Design a protein around this motif. Structure first.
Motif, PDB file in Angstrom:
ATOM      1  N   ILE A   1       0.849  -1.189   0.000  1.00 43.94           N
ATOM      2  CA  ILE A   1       0.000   0.000   0.000  1.00 43.94           C
ATOM      3  C   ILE A   1       0.883   1.236   0.000  1.00 43.94           C
ATOM      4  O   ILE A   1       1.811   1.364   0.814  1.00 43.94           O
TER       5      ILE A   1
ATOM      6  N   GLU B   1      -4.311  13.558  -0.997  1.00 42.58           N
ATOM      7  CA  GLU B   1      -3.737  12.258  -0.658  1.00 42.58           C
ATOM      8  C   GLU B   1      -4.323  11.192  -1.569  1.00 42.58           C
ATOM      9  O   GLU B   1      -5.538  11.149  -1.801  1.00 42.58           O
ATOM     10  N   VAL B   2      -3.461  10.338  -2.113  1.00 38.68           N
ATOM     11  CA  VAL B   2      -3.925   9.283  -2.992  1.00 38.68           C
ATOM     12  C   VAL B   2      -3.347   7.986  -2.447  1.00 38.68           C
ATOM     13  O   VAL B   2      -2.130   7.816  -2.423  1.00 38.68           O
ATOM     14  N   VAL B   3      -4.209   7.080  -2.006  1.00 43.10           N
ATOM     15  CA  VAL B   3      -3.762   5.868  -1.321  1.00 43.10           C
ATOM     16  C   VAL B   3      -4.268   4.672  -2.098  1.00 43.10           C
ATOM     17  O   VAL B   3      -5.461   4.586  -2.413  1.00 43.10           O
ATOM     18  N   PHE B   4      -3.357   3.761  -2.448  1.00 39.46           N
ATOM     19  CA  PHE B   4      -3.690   2.664  -3.356  1.00 39.46           C
ATOM     20  C   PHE B   4      -2.799   1.450  -3.120  1.00 39.46           C
ATOM     21  O   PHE B   4      -1.718   1.571  -2.547  1.00 39.46           O
ATOM     22  N   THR B   5      -3.248   0.286  -3.578  1.00 40.59           N
ATOM     23  CA  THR B   5      -2.404  -0.913  -3.532  1.00 40.59           C
ATOM     24  C   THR B   5      -1.746  -1.152  -4.881  1.00 40.59           C
ATOM     25  O   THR B   5      -2.408  -1.122  -5.919  1.00 40.59           O
TER      26      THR B   5
ATOM     27  N   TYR C   1       2.146   2.832 -13.484  1.00 46.82           N
ATOM     28  CA  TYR C   1       1.108   3.601 -12.809  1.00 46.82           C
ATOM     29  C   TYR C   1       1.332   5.094 -12.987  1.00 46.82           C
ATOM     30  O   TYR C   1       2.406   5.614 -12.651  1.00 46.82           O
TER      31      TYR C   1
ATOM     32  N   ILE D   1      -0.402   8.455 -11.545  1.00 43.65           N
ATOM     33  CA  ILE D   1      -1.366   9.049 -10.637  1.00 43.65           C
ATOM     34  C   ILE D   1      -1.499  10.496 -11.080  1.00 43.65           C
ATOM     35  O   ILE D   1      -0.538  11.268 -11.002  1.00 43.65           O
TER      36      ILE D   1
ATOM     37  N   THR E   1      -8.731  13.058  -8.797  1.00 39.91           N
ATOM     38  CA  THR E   1      -7.569  12.243  -9.084  1.00 39.91           C
ATOM     39  C   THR E   1      -7.983  10.969  -9.799  1.00 39.91           C
ATOM     40  O   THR E   1      -9.032  10.391  -9.507  1.00 39.91           O
ATOM     41  N   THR E   2      -7.163  10.534 -10.746  1.00 41.85           N
ATOM     42  CA  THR E   2      -7.412   9.296 -11.455  1.00 41.85           C
ATOM     43  C   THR E   2      -6.108   8.519 -11.580  1.00 41.85           C
ATOM     44  O   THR E   2      -5.022   9.072 -11.394  1.00 41.85           O
ATOM     45  N   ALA E   3      -6.236   7.236 -11.855  1.00 44.14           N
ATOM     46  CA  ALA E   3      -5.083   6.383 -12.089  1.00 44.14           C
ATOM     47  C   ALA E   3      -5.169   5.895 -13.521  1.00 44.14           C
ATOM     48  O   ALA E   3      -6.235   5.503 -13.997  1.00 44.14           O
ATOM     49  N   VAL E   4      -4.050   5.960 -14.224  1.00 44.65           N
ATOM     50  CA  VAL E   4      -3.943   5.373 -15.550  1.00 44.65           C
ATOM     51  C   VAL E   4      -2.903   4.266 -15.413  1.00 44.65           C
ATOM     52  O   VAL E   4      -1.718   4.536 -15.182  1.00 44.65           O
ATOM     53  N   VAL E   5      -3.357   3.029 -15.504  1.00 45.15           N
ATOM     54  CA  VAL E   5      -2.495   1.876 -15.284  1.00 45.15           C
ATOM     55  C   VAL E   5      -2.387   1.118 -16.600  1.00 45.15           C
ATOM     56  O   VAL E   5      -3.392   0.642 -17.126  1.00 45.15           O
ATOM     57  N   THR E   6      -1.172   1.031 -17.139  1.00 42.78           N
ATOM     58  CA  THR E   6      -0.976   0.498 -18.483  1.00 42.78           C
ATOM     59  C   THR E   6       0.204  -0.448 -18.557  1.00 42.78           C
ATOM     60  O   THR E   6       0.960  -0.579 -17.604  1.00 42.78           O
TER      61      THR E   6
END
Ligand SMILES: O=C(O)c1cccc(/C=C/c2ccc(B(O)O)cc2Cl)c1
Ligand SMILES: O=C(O)c1cccc(/C=C/c2ccc(B(O)O)cc2Cl)c1
Lengths: 116, 115, 115, 116
Positions: free
Chosen positions: B59, B83-87, B96, B98, B109-114
């Motif tokens: 985390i 604050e952006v908290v993620f696994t 990733y 953020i 806030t968004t996540a772009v996971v590629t």
């Protein structure tokens, strides 16, 4: 109602119901002390967290438990929670609405602050 | 570059430049241990935070110092920081990003996971 | 590249790929004249829409076909499309990026205008 | 109230007051016919636009006049307006809230759709 939390679901176009919310206040030793908690109603709103007397000046953290919310809809979301950290009441008492709009890999939060 | 942070300014319509960003990893005792940090570039981007070897599952918390950014612009803001908290999860895509879009009383806030 | 369009997916945490985008310019009679169009790439980006010479001051509309994007993913959406309407202004910075972050019942759009 | 519009200001942390709103409905000839209009109140809400009887199936466009709003605060904004285009009532009558959160170079819009 000096502090209200409202949560909306951007996938379903609805209030986000039954979302757990924990509020913390920074103590003199810089630790986060539990302040109040609850969950959103059928309208996506959480009322009654605190009172004008109890809600003194301080730095507050509103943690919205988004991960638990999504998993129950069958969605494996990105974030653990949405945290909203702000100084409150430093120019006297105000009323705060903390709103959050949720998607599985994104969230947006805004505050509406009014003077009683 | 397994982890990149990108910050944009919704008031000026620009990258958010010179914003301090701190990344923490959650330790076994639930405390947040400093992991990496930097300031966003002229493109609002922060690269080079970590490496594939170091960025293991766990985390993470990304703290973006939004208050200082707004204060430097003479604008009174609401939040202390974003604050952006993620696994981080090894099954998913490898890189990733953020991203955060900043206003004085709001942020998204968004996540772009590629791959 | 005076005008770029970028589209992201808030449900999957990814670029929004193969999204149709149409740009229109407002004519003297207030009607919308087709100006440029394309589909977003694997990075969610659409480049090469126009040139410096062609992209004169005026009112432009960028229509993003969000409904077809969600339908292709089997997800029921709210909007027919997302529309972004703005004035191009020569005094300001030269390059315009119109970005959009898509959810089934919501979208957010920002402009990043730079030199 | 089958159609309500709510507008918030992300710079000030307040309702967006006195925002003009024009609603259009696509006619059989594919043109946008004026349907209803109004402006947001002190709460940032616009009520009373239409009725259950009048608000039939159709494709509707809600144009929120954001540029006029910002200029009056001394801000030269990016967008001309925010447009929200959607099919309504195609599975029977619903209640729609169209919400928008405004910044000078950005806006976000979401819908809350409920079944009476
Ligand atoms: O779009 C975003 O970025 C966004 C972000 C955070 C919150 C909201 C929603 C605010 C809202 C508040 C009250 C009502 B209500 O039931 O009167 C309805 C709504 Cl949608 C929208
Ligand atoms: O949070 C919102 O509301 C929001 C709204 C509109 C756009 C964005 C995303 C901006 C972005 C731009 C460029 C890259 B990139 O691949 O370097 C990545 C990202 Cl996420 C976020």
């Amino acid at each position: 109602c000096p502090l209200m939390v409202k949560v909306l679901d951007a996938v379903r176009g609805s209030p986000a119901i039954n979302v757990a919310v924990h509020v913390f206040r920074k103590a003199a030793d810089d630790t986060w002390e539990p302040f109040a908690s609850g969950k959103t109603s059928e309208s996506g709103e959480l009322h009654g967290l605190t009172t004008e007397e109890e809600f003194v000046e301080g730095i507050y953290k509103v943690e919205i438990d988004t991960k638990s919310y999504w998993k129950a809809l069958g969605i494996s979301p990105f974030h653990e929670h949405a945290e909203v950290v702000f100084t409150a009441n430093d120019s006297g008492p105000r009323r705060y609405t903390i709103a959050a709009l949720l998607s599985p890999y994104s969230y947006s939060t805004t505050a509406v602050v009014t003077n009683p």
